[PDB]
Amino acid sequence: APERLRSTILTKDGINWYYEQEGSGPDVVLIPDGLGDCQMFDKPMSIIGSSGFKVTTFDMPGMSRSSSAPPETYQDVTGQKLANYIVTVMDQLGIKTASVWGCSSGASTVLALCSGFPERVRNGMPHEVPTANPENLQNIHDADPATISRDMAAVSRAMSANEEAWDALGPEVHERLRDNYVRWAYGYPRTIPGSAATKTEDLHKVPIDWTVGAAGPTQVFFENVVIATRESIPIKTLPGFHFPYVSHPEAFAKYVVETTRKYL
Amino acid sequence: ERLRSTILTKDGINWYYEQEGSGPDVVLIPDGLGDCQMFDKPMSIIGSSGFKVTTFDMPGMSRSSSAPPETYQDVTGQKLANYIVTVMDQLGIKTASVWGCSSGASTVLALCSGFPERVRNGMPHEVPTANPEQNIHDADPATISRDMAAVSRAMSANEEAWDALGPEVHERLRDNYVRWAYGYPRTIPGSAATKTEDLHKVPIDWTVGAAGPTQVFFENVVIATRESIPIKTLPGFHFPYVSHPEAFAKYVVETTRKYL
Ligand code: NA
Ligand code: NA
């Protein structure tokens, strides 16, 4: 049975990344959603990493156990900025090419990697790319930190589509997330959607297989379905909503594995 | 003034129908439960915008329930389109702007493909495209009614407005659920007229419900986008005319005005 490496690694951009690896074979990189906590991949990482892949994941810059990082790394955040940082960590880890998953700002990062670093991406798996600045979160940064944490915890839980799996992440994870919510609010929603690499010139350098959440309201990532279809990119639903790796870890892992096997 | 009446067409169907207003014709085809009282509020709003609005209970359903079995068994868009063109002929409706949800939408597409001379513009909403994941429909009829009333209420997105249809409507729906179950879900989804050759004989403006789970009518967004057909969300889910009658009426009116 493969064992899980859990460690830290420094990069030249100043970030002390917390990261984990499991398995052997072609590289698969699992980029977190905006909350930046890779413990949400723990279960499917074992599944994917037993299916003939070396899986790498990490907490995102400024978030959780990667919190030792320069402020610019988690402020005015864009897919392009995060893509640069991920290519730097790939270099340090000796990852030449990878099949890359990401949801939300993680998907913004997938698209920016596919556009800007196609030589490093075997195939991209974006899920629920933010494409508009959300109405409900228009002034979330302007609120007081305790309120940011409380309201964003509620929103995240509602977007999990499996409240029991979400809670079962456990108290350690939800304590880390408490602080991340604030840093996320300050650094992500105002800049991430406008950074989406969703032009024709972004989307056809490498293979892309796009997903949205089956249980999300049609309205929420509607434009993802439009963009992918207009561009003739494979688009389908996954079980759950915004955290498929938490709500439905087996189906998530199967998706990642079958999709990646297409391009081996 | 709302006209409420009946006609026997040549398919053997004793239709219950309603008409209100003056102006270009707008036809509102029910969803698969087949009951046009769901249109009562928005029918008046549309009619007051300068249109003549016609609606009807569907064959075998509600007040149109006297009909031969073939009209409510093995139902397809194409069969329903044939029947509705005969209604149009009998009422003297030459061309119409046609709205429909669910099997109603299947009927819109079949009208647009099969009878383009008769359709000014089509407004499909939530066209069924996949067989509901049917072997279990050899249940008691009361069980079918129970389970289909629950599904329908959950697809309304405004449970208070759904309940507010009132007992007369829900008592009609009770028997309609059973007929619908036996006649519609195995055959309607395959009948969807969604080939490129079906979809470009008249203008179409496609909608899905903003609040429906993405997976349910996902493929509608794909098809419409692939074909460069206008596609957008309406408030609510599967019964916008019930949940959001004002937004619904405004949509039908503004869309129809595009083509005048
Ligand atoms: Na590549
Ligand atoms: Na026409």
Q: Is B156 a catalytic residue?
A: no
State the pairing for strand pair A98-103/A210-213: unpaired
Contact B39, B58 (CB under 8 A): no
Token pair, residue A63, equals: 């978030």
Query: Which residues of A are less than 8 Å from B217 in CB distance?
Result: 218
DSSP helix/strand/coil, A257: helix
Contact A213 B214 (CB under 8 A): yes
- Burial class, A246, CB count within 10 angstroms (exposed 0-12 / middle 13-18 / buried 19+): buried
Ligand 1 center–CA A28 separation, angstroms:
13
Q: Is B97 a catalytic residue?
A: no
Q: What angle do CA A68, A69, A75 make, to 5 degrees?
A: 130
Contact A216 B212 (CB under 8 A): no
Q: Under an 8 Å CB criterion, which residues of B touch A?
A: 208-218, 221-222, 225-226, 231, 233
Query: At what resolution in Å was this solved?
Result: 1.8
**Sheet bearing A235-238, strands edge to edge:** A5-10, A16-23, A54-58, A27-31, A98-103, A121-127, A210-213, A235-238
* Domain range list for chain B: 1-260
Separation CA B117–CA B132 (nearest Å): 33
Q: Is residue B99 marked as binding?
A: no
Separation CA A173–CA A67 (nearest Å): 14
SS (H, E, C) B139-180: CCHHHHHHHHHHHHHHCCCCHHHHHCCCHHHHHHHHHHHHHH
Query: Which residues of A are less than 8 Å from B215 in CB distance?
Result: 214-215, 237
Starting from the CA of residue B118, give the closest ligand: 2
Name which of A212, A222, A230 is nearest B233 (Cβ-Cβ). Answer: A222
Phi-psi label, residue A129: left if phi above 0, alpha if psi -120 to 50, beta otherwise: beta
State the pairing for strand pair B2-8/B25-29: unpaired
Cβ-Cβ pairs closer than 8 A, A with B, add up to 52
Token pair, residue A192, equals: 């991430």
Separation CA B181–CA A203 (nearest Å): 43
Contact B63, B172 (CB under 8 A): yes
Query: Which residues of A are less than 8 Å from B221 in CB distance?
Result: 218, 222, 225-226, 229
Ligand 2 center–CA B200 separation, angstroms:
10
Return the bridge partners of B162, or none: none
DSSP helix/strand/coil, A99: strand
Separation CA A229–CA A64 (nearest Å): 36
DSSP helix/strand/coil, A242: coil
Q: Is B238 a catalytic residue?
A: yes
Separation CA B36–CA B55 (nearest Å): 6
Q: What is the experimental method?
A: X-ray
For helices A222-230 and B218-226, the axis angle rounded to 10 degrees is: 40
- Backbone phi, psi, residue B143, to 5°: -65, -45
Strands (E), A39-97: 54-58
Contact A217 B222 (CB under 8 A): no
